């Protein structure tokens, strides 16, 4: 035990390394795949159960399942068989080789941190370990101490407002409206051109043509009037089986829900509705830090030309007098494992771990109350 | 030990300087701010109490309150905090450096006084110190023996009368409408237009409204009869947020309240009847020299257009034959301690200073005597 | 025109009747619906827009927004829309039948009560109207003429004295923080349990869910221990979908903001200190027969056990030598239009009214200065 | 043009009639065959091609070929051909005789619809023409206004959530599991008896087959352990050459596929998990009133005792304390004809239709946006 653990488990996309490193050693997908068909073959019981990378290069002849979704834990044997793998297999450390900062999102159910902390102890035996916030070790691998956080990930989006030092809760906005309700968009947009991918493994070819061809338009309306010249646009990705599809305005329909979820039948307003309205809930003075520091992080706002439009629409909110300063890093998708590196090789922090003995003698309840 | 400190602790602005000086070097406002929300990063026990120019600052964040009002102390730790602050953080001079000359309004608690002294003598351990009255020493910053003082600083308000060296006692009126009385107020009127501030950083962005737009109508029914052109008179000031706000006839309806204390629910008459039922109390022959020198003191007389209305009606008021004129320095919001510095370094006054020994061998009812 | 109509338009919930009458005839919610789908059945213009009982009954598919809040109206033309409503589709009366007697919160906009009168003026043309203060009909309600009256209703909460027969302005205290203040607490702290209700039409669910489960802990820290035998306090609620919930310490723990209201955010204090601070700012002598009459009015305070929580420590803020008396009638929730429908049948009333002639005449700054 | 046609071109089986009559008079099955001998008589070039009722009865020496597909028109060449089958030879009206409305399932590429638009107008030259939604009008058939509807027709199945007029398309479920790969399925699972269809002639023995003796099991399990006493279960059906067979537990293994998808090799839930799934999207108010309504319709929902066991697999996930029932009017394989009969006999409807000056000055997109 001289380094941490610092393994932050997204809501589909599972990354872990060692406390100080500059970059996470263990990036994998958080899938669980079980075999459906038979298995003629002498390998009857030959892996019932896929775990990650495997179950992704093999997910013909698999149903795969994400044991995460909107950052709950909803199945906790395949979360156990995920982590597992992660410390044996991946990073081929003892569990009670070191502590583990675990990360979770804002405003989760109280029942999940708990069952991740009783897990951890009784199941791995790590001597020590603390569950950050996704939203304050953003702000770690910028090194700053005041700004808005919009960490958009996978299962979930949330603003958090910070003050130098002082979080403001009261005014974390959360939103069910993340990458995988997007990917469940671009596969329903896509039948309207004639391709239809209705399998869990095709789930994950959608989100691969997602994840290349498609950019956030700085105008709707004009980018829409734009594709009737129907060639300036239209891309061509190549399927798995040689065969090739061509989306157009499809290109840039799918990530406009993150700024119309209406698209998806929801009553909420955009990312940039749940930005200005959790700045107009902080109190009046540091209402001019925060709109000059929207640092953003997360998978999903990785998208091209994200922060323009952003930074063009709360623009059109905000008092014209002050400034609106987007700041996205460009390696923001690890910009929270960067910031649990940070916060774990502190000598300030080394104080606040929960350790074995301090769990067993002060009941679950324990680790709710380091810092909310 | 060859100059002296001159610390005039006001009821909302602490200045402090050194005696010979020509202006304080020290002006910061009296107030103690502590943090409020949880200050989820690394700095938890970081200054959890600021106070002066970064409770200020930073007053996103922060309660913020006061520990002098109505020129009483209420709160003995943040006072003791703030001379800390003012003898170490910003003159930088050790306590046992120099005397000290404190000030006080007339008529205060027999105990605000003596706790003064207490701690000034056991907690920094100056090797001398005397309390002024603040209605003494802005005579000395105009150079007179003659006048009727009104003092209206910003918890407390009153006159005082003086003839060629003699105080009369008997004549001293009290009153606890102040600058602040008159923030709370423009906190109330301004309701009716429809901007809310209610909390404790809101009221520090009232006082700066009501420092800029607010002046003194010399005479009311016909200003609040030309606000009815609902052009001529409206100001626009802009938030620290970008936001504006236009107040119309708010900006003379605020400092009115000093001459109809009734708008604040008050039963004593105004600033005009206070000084002029001041100088029918005294004898009938000094009446005469004290009407023609009505120095004016304080921070909140100030307004644009206060000397003008004062002089308009204790005109209206004394008989018809003889002089009012009212002698408004320009300096006048640091007249108090100009005297102070003035007093603390004439060598006729190296005398009255109260030493540890005097103390001492004397009780804590030996600062009473020095001249009233 | 022999009766008269009294509205008490409230924050959240309409009430109206006629004068004379013992309890309103038409109660309704004041919501304005508008659907959100696209209605492919032949009824494609059939009602875009419900108001009402309609727009509660239909709110599956519908953007339910109110047009008042804090008291302040913030949607003219859905007000117009309710108001009308009120008129020909629930009482089933002419406007010109009668006279009418509108309510509206203290220290409000001068703008709103203007609008108001010029609304039911040259829309409606009422032959007469008077607006009242929801603090005074409170105390007709009850036949008293000396108290003090908390009317926290569901957009605001309000403090006001009064002697026997003059109110005492200075000393009202305002607070914005209400019921649906609270049923916004009451949706975020519910998400801790797994529950989450964001729509509007959830917000109709959780509202609910206030009104029948949520009582007011006598003490808090200790309800609060109690509900760690987590069986003792649960209570389970069947959603309209047939699903059930089970909510424990969060039946305290939403009107608790109300005597805590840094829960949401909010530097002021409990209702507990806004009726006290109110009383020691009446006059020394009327401070006796104020204590001795708290009338409760308004629907917030209808929580099971508030009135013995008020008592029990405002007891411990007041000397220690007289009467603390929370006088609550059964039937408080309407005790503002009781008062309404007393003071529109009295005959020393039947003068005040402001009739269409003696408004044009006067202009619309004609209805604030009868009596405040 | 009085009167308007009603023509539902349904996956296998066209259906045709005029806007009035109460049920369609030309159902024929929508076959385009080819002989595929030689034709040694005189008649060489004798009908190169039958279509619908002809092409049924001389099905022994044609192959046999739908030009519909799981609800996509896959064949232009053979639809024109079977429309112009329609109109001429079967209704015997010409195409300018009235207005048209066609019908197409829901969520089918962008494509389809434009191409059909543009043949009925370039090449019939109708007057007018309208295309509704296959799941809207089986409502209309009803009289209902809400309601979820399970249109498994023979090329697709759907489920479609409607409430009062408005229809929810965030949850409209499509699955293309339908009539036609049941027969599939049963021409395989009938070789493990010994009979082996394998032409396209004896596609359409084996869909007699399936429509005679096939019907699904209450409980699964039970049924299958009840045809070991191989007796009380085994049919025979006679076949057209005289031959008989006798099919056991293949009556009720080939119409479970709809509620196990994975007999034919699909992950995808059953039509009692694909309503389900789909009312637990609906928001949650209404998802009380479309539990009580699951209008069937479409062919393949005429299984006996499919009714009963929808009403009893949904009643297992629903809430325990609210109602489960399945509408099964008697005559579902047309409602939605009749519906379609129903929404072009309306006076509210003779609006809607798109004449040919109105799509030539608009263009092709004119045809989408007419309610989705
Ligand atoms: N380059 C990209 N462009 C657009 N979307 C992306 C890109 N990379 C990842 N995503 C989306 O972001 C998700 C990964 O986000 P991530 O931050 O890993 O989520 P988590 O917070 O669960 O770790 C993926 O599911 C994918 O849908
Ligand atoms: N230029 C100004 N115009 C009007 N009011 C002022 C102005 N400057 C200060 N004030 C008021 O006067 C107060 C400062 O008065 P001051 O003399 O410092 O009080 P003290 O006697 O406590 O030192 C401030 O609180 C402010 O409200
Ligand atoms: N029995 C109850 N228990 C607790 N809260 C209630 C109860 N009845 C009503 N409320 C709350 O009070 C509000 C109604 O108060 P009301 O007096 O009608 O407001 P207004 O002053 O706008 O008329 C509702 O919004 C509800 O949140
Ligand atoms: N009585 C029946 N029992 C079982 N299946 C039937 C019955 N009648 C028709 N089918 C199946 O339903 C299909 C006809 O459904 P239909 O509603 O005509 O489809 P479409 O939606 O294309 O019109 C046929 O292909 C047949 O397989
Ligand atoms: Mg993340
Ligand atoms: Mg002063
Ligand atoms: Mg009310
Ligand atoms: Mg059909």
């Known amino acids: 035990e001289t380094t941490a653990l610092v ?34 073959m002498v390998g009857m ?53 070191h502590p583990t900062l675990l990360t979770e999102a804002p405003l989760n159910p109280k029942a999940n941190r708990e069952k991740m902390t009783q897990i ?69 947009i896509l039948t309207e051109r004639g391709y239809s991918f209705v399998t869990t493994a095709e789930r994950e070819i959608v989100r691969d043509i997602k994840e290349k061809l498609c950019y956030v338009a700085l105008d709707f309306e004009n980018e829409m009037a734009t594709a009737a010249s129907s060639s300036s646009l239209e891309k061509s990705y190549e399927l798995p089986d040689g065969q090739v599809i061509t989306i ?25 509705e749940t930005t200005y309205n959790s700045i107009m809930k902080c109190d009046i003075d540091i209402r001019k830090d925060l709109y000059a520091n929207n640092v953003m992080s997360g998978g999903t706002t990785m998208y091209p030309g994200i922060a323009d439009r952003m930074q063009k629409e709360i623009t059109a909110l905000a008092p014209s007098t ?28 080394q104080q606040m771990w929960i350790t074995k003995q301090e769990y067993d003698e002060a009941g679950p309840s324990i680790v709710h109350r380091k810092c909310f």
Chains 1, 2, 3, 4 share one sequence.
């Open 7 to 40: 393994c932050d488990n997204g809501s589909g996309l599972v990354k872990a390394g060692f406390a100080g490193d500059d970059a996470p050693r263990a990036v994998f997908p958080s899938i669980v795949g079980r075999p459906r068909h038979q298995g003629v």
């Open 45 to 97: 019981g030959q892996k019932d159960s896929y775990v990650g990378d495997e179950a992704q290069s093999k997910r013909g002849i698999l149903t795969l399942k994400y044991p995460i979704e909107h950052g709950i834990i909803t199945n906790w044997d395949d979360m156990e068989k995920i982590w597992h793998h992660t410390f044996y297999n991946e990073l081929r450390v003892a569990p009670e080789e």
């Open 120 to 188: 951890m102890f009784e199941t791995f035996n790590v001597p020590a370990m603390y569950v950050a916030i996704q939203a304050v070790l953003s702000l770690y691998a910028s090194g700053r101490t005041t700004g808005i956080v919009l960490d958009s990930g996978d299962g979930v989006t949330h603003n958090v407002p910070i003050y130098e030092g002082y979080a403001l809760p009261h005014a974390i906005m959360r939103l069910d409206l993340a990458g995988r309700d997007l990917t469940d968009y671009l596969m329903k």
């Open 248 to 272: 157009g305005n499809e290109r840039f329909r799918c990530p406009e829900t993150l700024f119309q979820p209406s698209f998806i039948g929801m009553e909420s307003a955009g990312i940039h």
């Open 322 to 349: 002050m400034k609106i300063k987007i700041i996205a890093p460009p390696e923001r998708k690890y910009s929270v494992w960067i910031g649990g590196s940070i916060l774990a090789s502190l000598s300030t922090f």
